[PDB]
Amino acid sequence: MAGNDSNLIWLDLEMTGLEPVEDVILEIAIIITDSELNILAQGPIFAISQTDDVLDNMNPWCIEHHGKSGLTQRCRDSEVSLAHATKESLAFVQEWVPQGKSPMCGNSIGQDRRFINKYMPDFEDHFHYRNLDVSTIKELAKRWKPEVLESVVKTGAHLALDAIKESIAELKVYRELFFKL
Amino acid sequence: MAGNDSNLIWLDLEMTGLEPVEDVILEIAIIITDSELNILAQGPIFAISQTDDVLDNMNPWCIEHHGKSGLTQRCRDSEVSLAHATKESLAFVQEWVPQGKSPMCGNSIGQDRRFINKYMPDFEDHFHYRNLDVSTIKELAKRWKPEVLESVVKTGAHLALDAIKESIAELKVYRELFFKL
């Protein structure tokens, strides 16, 4: 099933803040599912090597939340450059889905896409221009059928890996309870 | 009914191309709906003043399509500035939904957002950070229930209200046929 036109690239980034103009990427994880949301593969996980003054002067939210998740320390200890993570990610994703076919999948994935466009345009090129944004459906559920949100489970932050598994599980809940089979 | 929390702000833009690094906005159109997708208001439509330096040197797709469309000439005839379009759009929108409540709605509305974020920062501030991307559901339809696309009405009209009302209507189809409400 490695090359199916309908497979999906799921990803989550962690950043030093919200604005691509000043902020940089700290973490990347990728999961490939088939079109039915079965998990076909996990990409490597990269904490991105960043200097201490970058890590120390990020967003208050980020100091707290990345400090808590253990990401900050993992970037202190990493030798991984963004340049390397971009090559590996692109090669992995190429191994699984044809160029141009899969939209970018995840929660508020357009935010991530801003960072990928600016900092990893080679990687972005493998994707379709479309976004599969799980938060779109959450917003429709909030207004159309909010009790569905009760079945949605949100665990605590560790890896970007975990945040992706949450997005998939969330969409899986919607498929079962919110969309018509 | 004015200023209700679940009211939804819809928009489409037309541009000189795909890369807002140095591409610009040709047209702005905005529709408000309640949470049921009932159209509550049409917003000021704005073709944006661009010199022939800009209009002559758009992409091939844009020269040919914005030419038959009538928009290129409208931007040449147009007196309204970027700031005036920003100031007005913000005002209209401010009437109909409280601040931070509404995601930004439309097809691939993240692309639009990149242009709104750079050239109209004040306007984007009124939205929730979330996107409501109908094309997310179109991507799911294609994979889960393609028969549903048959009822979607895609003319191919690349204008202002043209493509908006088509995004709103496309969501209405999904609501009847694709969602379990």
Which H, E and C letters describe B18-69, residue by residue? Answer: CCCCCCCEEEEEEEEECCCCCEEEECCCEECCCCHHHHCCCCHHHHHHHHHH
Within 8 A by CB and 6+ apart from A47, the residues are A26, A27, A71, A74, A75, A77, A78, A80
Degrees, nearest 5: CA angle B64-B66-B67: 60
Report the residue of B35, B136, B142 to disrupt the A interface, i.e. the one with the largest count of A CBs within 10 Å: B136
Helix (H, G, I), strand (E, B) or coil at A150: helix
Residue positions of A annotated with a catalytic role: 129
Q: Are A105 and A10 in contact (CB under 8 A)?
A: yes
Q: Give resolution, Å, one decimal.
A: 2.5
* Cβ–Cβ below 8 Å for B132 and A110: no
Pairing of strands B25-33, B46-47: antiparallel
* Cβ–Cβ below 8 Å for B103 and A136: yes
Q: Give the one of B6, B133, B179 whose C-beta lies nearest to A136's C-beta.
A: B133
Report the residue of A132, A142, A148, A173 to disrupt the B interface, i.e. the one with the largest count of B CBs within 10 Å: A132
Distances (CA, A) of B150 to A14, B106, B177: 39, 19, 11
**Deposited experimental method:** X-ray
- Residue B113 sits at the chain A interface (C-beta within 8 Å): yes
Partners of residue A180 in chain B, C-beta under 8 Å: 145, 177-180
Helix (H, G, I), strand (E, B) or coil at A69: helix
Token duo for residue A164: 């992706």
Q: How far apart are CA A37 and CA A40, in angstroms?
A: 9
User: To the nearest whole angstrom, how far is the Cα of A58 from the nearest Cα of chain B?
Assistant: 20
Partners of residue A101 in chain B, C-beta under 8 Å: none
By C-alpha distance, the chain B residue nearest A132 is B136
By C-alpha distance, the chain B residue nearest A111 is B110
Q: How far apart are CA B161 and CA B39, in angstroms?
A: 12
Half-sphere exposure at residue B40, Cβ-oriented, CA atoms within 13 angstroms: 20
Residue positions of B annotated with a catalytic role: 129
Q: Where are the domains of chain A?
A: 1-181
Closest CA to B8 of B140, B143, B147, B101: B101
Partners of residue A136 in chain B, C-beta under 8 Å: 103, 130-134, 136-137
Amino acid identity at B50: Q
Q: What is the dihedral of CA A106, A110, A114, A115, to 10 degrees?
A: -20
- CATH 3.40.50.300 describes domain A1-181: no
